[PDB]
Amino acid sequence: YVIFEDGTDPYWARSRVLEYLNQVQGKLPAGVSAELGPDATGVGWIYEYALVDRSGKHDLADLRSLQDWFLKYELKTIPDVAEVASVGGVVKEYQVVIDPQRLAQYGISLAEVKSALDASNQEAGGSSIELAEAEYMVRASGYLQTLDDFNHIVLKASENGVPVYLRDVAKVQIGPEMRRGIAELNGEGEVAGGVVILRSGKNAREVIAAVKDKLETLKSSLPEGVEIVTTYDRSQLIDRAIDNLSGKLLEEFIVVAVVCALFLWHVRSALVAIISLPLGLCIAFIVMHFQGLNANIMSLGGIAIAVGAMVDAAIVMIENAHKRLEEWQHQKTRWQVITDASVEVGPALFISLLIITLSFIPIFTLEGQEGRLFGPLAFTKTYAMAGAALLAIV
Amino acid sequence: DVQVIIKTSYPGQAPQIVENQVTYPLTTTMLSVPGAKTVRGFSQFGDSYVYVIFEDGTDPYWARSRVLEYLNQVQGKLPAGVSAELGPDATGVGWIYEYA
Amino acid sequence: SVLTVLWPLNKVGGEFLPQINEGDLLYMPSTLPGISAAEAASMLQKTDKL
Amino acid sequence: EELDNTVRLPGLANLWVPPIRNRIDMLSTGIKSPIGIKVSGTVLADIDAMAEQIEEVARTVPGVASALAERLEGGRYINVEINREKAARYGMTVADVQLFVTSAVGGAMVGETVEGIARYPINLRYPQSWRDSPQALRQLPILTPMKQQITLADVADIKVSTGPSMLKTENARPTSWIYIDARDRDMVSVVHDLQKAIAEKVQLKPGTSVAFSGQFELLERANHKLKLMVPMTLMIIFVLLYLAFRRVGEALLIISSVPFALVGGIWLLWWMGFHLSVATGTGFIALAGVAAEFGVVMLMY
Amino acid sequence: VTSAVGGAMVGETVEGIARYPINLRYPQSWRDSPQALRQLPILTPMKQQI
Amino acid sequence: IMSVPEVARVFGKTGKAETATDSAPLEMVETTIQLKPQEQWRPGMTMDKII
Amino acid sequence: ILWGTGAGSEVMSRIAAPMIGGMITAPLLSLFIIPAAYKLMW
Numbered sequence A: 001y002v003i004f005e006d007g008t009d010p011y012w013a014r015s016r017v018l019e020y021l022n023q024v025q026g027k028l029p030a031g032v033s034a035e036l037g038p039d040a041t042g043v044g045w046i047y048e049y050a051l052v053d054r055s056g057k058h059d060l061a062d063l064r065s066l067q068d069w070f071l072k073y074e075l076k077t078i079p080d081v082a083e084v085a086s087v088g089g090v091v092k093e094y095q096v097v098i099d100p101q102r103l104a105q106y107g108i109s110l111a112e113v114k115s116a117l118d119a120s121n122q123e124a125g126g127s128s129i130e131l132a133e134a135e136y137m138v139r140a141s142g143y144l145q146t147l148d149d150f151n152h153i154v155l156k157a158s159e160n161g162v163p164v165y166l167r168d169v170a171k172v173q174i175g176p177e178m179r180r181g182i183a184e185l186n187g188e189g190e191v192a193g194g195v196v197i198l199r200s201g202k203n204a205r206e207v208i209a210a211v212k213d214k215l216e217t218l219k220s221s222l223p224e225g226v227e228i229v230t231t232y233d234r235s236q237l238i239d240r241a242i243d244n245l246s247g248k249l250l251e252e253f254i255v256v257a258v259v260c261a262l263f264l265w266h267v268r269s270a271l272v273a274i275i276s277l278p279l280g281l282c283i284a285f286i287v288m289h290f291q292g293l294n295a296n297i298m299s300l301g302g303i304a305i306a307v308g309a310m311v312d313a314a315i316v317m318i319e320n321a322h323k324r325l326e327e328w329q330h331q332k333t334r335w336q337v338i339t340d341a342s343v344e345v346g347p348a349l350f351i352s353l354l355i356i357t358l359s360f361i362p363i364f365t366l367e368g369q370e371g372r373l374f375g376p377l378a379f380t381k382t383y384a385m386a387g388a389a390l391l392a393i394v
Numbered sequence B: 001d002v003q004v005i006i007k008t009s010y011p012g013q014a015p016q017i018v019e020n021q022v023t024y025p026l027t028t029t030m031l032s033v034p035g036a037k038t039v040r041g042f043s044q045f046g047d048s049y050v051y052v053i054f055e056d057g058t059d060p061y062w063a064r065s066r067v068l069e070y071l072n073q074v075q076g077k078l079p080a081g082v083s084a085e086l087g088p089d090a091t092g093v094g095w096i097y098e099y100a
Numbered sequence C: 001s002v003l004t005v006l007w008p009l010n011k012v013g014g015e016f017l018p019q020i021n022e023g024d025l026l027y028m029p030s031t032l033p034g035i036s037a038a039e040a041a042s043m044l045q046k047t048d049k050l
Numbered sequence D: 001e002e003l004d005n006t007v008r009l010p011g012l013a014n015l016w017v018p019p020i021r022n023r024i025d026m027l028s029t030g031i032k033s034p035i036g037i038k039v040s041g042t043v044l045a046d047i048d049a050m051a052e053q054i055e056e057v058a059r060t061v062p063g064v065a066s067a068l069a070e071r072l073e074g075g076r077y078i079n080v081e082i083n084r085e086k087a088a089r090y091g092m093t094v095a096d097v098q099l100f101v102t103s104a105v106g107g108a109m110v111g112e113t114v115e116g117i118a119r120y121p122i123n124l125r126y127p128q129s130w131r132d133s134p135q136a137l138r139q140l141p142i143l144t145p146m147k148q149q150i151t152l153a154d155v156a157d158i159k160v161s162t163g164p165s166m167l168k169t170e171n172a173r174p175t176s177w178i179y180i181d182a183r184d185r186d187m188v189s190v191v192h193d194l195q196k197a198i199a200e201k202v203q204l205k206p207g208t209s210v211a212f213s214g215q216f217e218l219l220e221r222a223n224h225k226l227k228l229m230v231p232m233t234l235m236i237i238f239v240l241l242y243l244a245f246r247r248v249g250e251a252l253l254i255i256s257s258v259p260f261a262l263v264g265g266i267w268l269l270w271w272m273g274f275h276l277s278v279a280t281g282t283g284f285i286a287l288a289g290v291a292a293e294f295g296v297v298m299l300m301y
Numbered sequence E: 001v002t003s004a005v006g007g008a009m010v011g012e013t014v015e016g017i018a019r020y021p022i023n024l025r026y027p028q029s030w031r032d033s034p035q036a037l038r039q040l041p042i043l044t045p046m047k048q049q050i
Numbered sequence F: 001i002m003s004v005p006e007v008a009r010v011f012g013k014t015g016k017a018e019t020a021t022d023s024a025p026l027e028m029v030e031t032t033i034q035l036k037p038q039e040q041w042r043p044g045m046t047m048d049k050i051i
Numbered sequence G: 001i002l003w004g005t006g007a008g009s010e011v012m013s014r015i016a017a018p019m020i021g022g023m024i025t026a027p028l029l030s031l032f033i034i035p036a037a038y039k040l041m042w
Ligand SMILES: [Cu+]
Pocket: F024, F028, F030
């Protein structure tokens, strides 16, 4: 892991890291290679799905192979899905197992056997030729694609002969490649599948949606007796949480309307309360967009309690407006004088909203992981409050 | 539009082992690159040209920078001497002056 | 008079987006896959004559 | 016209384009064709068979078009089938056999020579004479690790087959794109008839998928977004019409107005038999701007 | 120690668009326990059996 | 885990999973438990209670 | 722009044409949508 100071253009930071990643590739082993991480954070684990079979026809190794060279390719296509992890299953493996006694007898060392394998599985062609008029491309395959072929690898042979083959000192058998990650579903057990990961910052909900349509569409192609059982759907917590805040806000308008009705015995405050919020709400959503923050539970939590502290400007304005009218009920320009005194109640009110916002900065000051977790709730509010002050004046 | 060209030459060969050998490792490593829209490449007799398309309006140099991320993980997996080339820096418009 | 303009809108006259003109021309002919390099250089020369 | 008529030969269909546009057209990868489909798969054989079966469904569905399955496999080959077992009897590695296939019969450059600031290639190959024809190949002389003197035919069977002239693939794996072309009509309906008619009464092979692409994907979006713009553009236009004089009668007049102003312009398309373009629509947009102005200036008076 | 007793993959096999590993190792029986290791049979550059 | 009547699906993962993100040995047992709407299936039984 | 163009006017014309025709109709319309339509409006 390479850690950078908070708030560094990630892609930039990833770019810098690479600088010296190239100076190293040659210094480490053969085949062994260095991998740069994905592109998502630890949050990026969005959708997880198991690949099980409602029968016994399709193999464990078969499933892993299905998820690896089919599904994974199908889903990585989807927009902001960084990578589609593969989990569990088992790897179809071609196992050449030597027999020491057979080696002794024929007198061929391991080095010899290894050199043969590296020289028994390749393909090549060497230019074209002018037969007739058209040119022909000349190819060849030495391709290991049958156990017959695995067996028929010459090791030691001689003139006028016999030929010692690999079949002669080893048994070639498909097997399970030494496991590094085992996955399972319920008591039933042992099953392969894959996780979906979100390329940093991009409404996970949508990414899940795009995935789910694909899966629905794909299930047609699936072999017989295999089901994609969802193990995870971040969308649900997102939906649940979002529907939660969708309700509280309306519930807040009605509560306010009811309380108003009891205090001013009914008044268009209904539309007034509802107008003040969405606007002070709509500025918070205008600003966060610009400075591209998020929409995490915190940010949403911010606007919620803001609604609660934006009542006084509306309440205080109205009272003074209501009291100013009554003076003319006791006895254009005359609606203007009612405004004038709505102006007398303006100054300090207005300024009280502005003074409220600034005090929040100490919260920004804390700089833990938690502190940065809370920045949202405070960032949304801090910017919503100042705009709420202008809000109040409009 | 915004794209990154990845030419790979092979002295002589064939449409199968020019892909199987060099572009099969090239196209597949590029699937994971941050921001890649579609990774469609043309393999052919002797050459492997691989295009990476990005969404319209992406800092080209940035886009070219991202592409490179995984271009390094591949150099060792393809043949000897055979090497991967990042495109030039001009678009299809860039062909200005031609002289015999 | 808007009617008289409407008969047109459905007929649209003829053709769509242009292609524009440059001082020169480029020639490319679907040709078929396999050929010789010599036969290529030959055809090239003949074409440069026509 | 003269050129197209002057230069004419077999196998060649002439195309005449300008410099800039051509160069642009030779990099922008995709499908000019209004519509096409992609069948992704694990092996060339599978997805190819799909194109064949889809073709009939293309010609059949109400829609004029020519389905281009695979103008690709026009490649002439010479398969050198190395019989491992016969190479074994000679104590030879498939690689060693290929040594002759690649260097002796190809000419794989075995290094280059530095002349200061320049380097030219070094080529190691059998004489031109021995690489002349398949027969030549069959008789290609090989000397074994045991100074046995044999011929490529002894360890290989060479056959002439016809395969790919090139290989195109979408996202690592192989996909064939069939081009179906319908012209001058918004064919957004056809793509849905196919995606469902297929499922209901036409099958498929596990290990593959089907993708629909063409000029329409982006077009449909363009149309969609444009049609959101007209309500939004009118709403702002209305707010900008109503504010100089307030009344809706005039503002509604101007809106109900513009269409007739557009007449002369399109009747201009009439002598000219003029196409129409985003450009003609660009003029229309400007026309409608000046006329609206004229209405305003006159209404005030 | 690495191939016979480990199972260091000595290459993979291309099935179109997929590749599985090839593993070269002594029989499961000879890698069972430290004792097994002590008796792990080696044949020298001189066909000596140790 | 599946025994509990308040758990829906369950997923056992032991180790890593073909991704640079996960770095867990074969010891590292890592399971995802899926829960049902508290419509089901119990009276009381709060989150910490389940736990 | 209509009579000659050695430098790309397959496009300038396309947007130019509408302008003229509309400019023969536009003056006229401005003239007779102003009075008639007005008295009809009220
Ligand atoms: Cu863990």
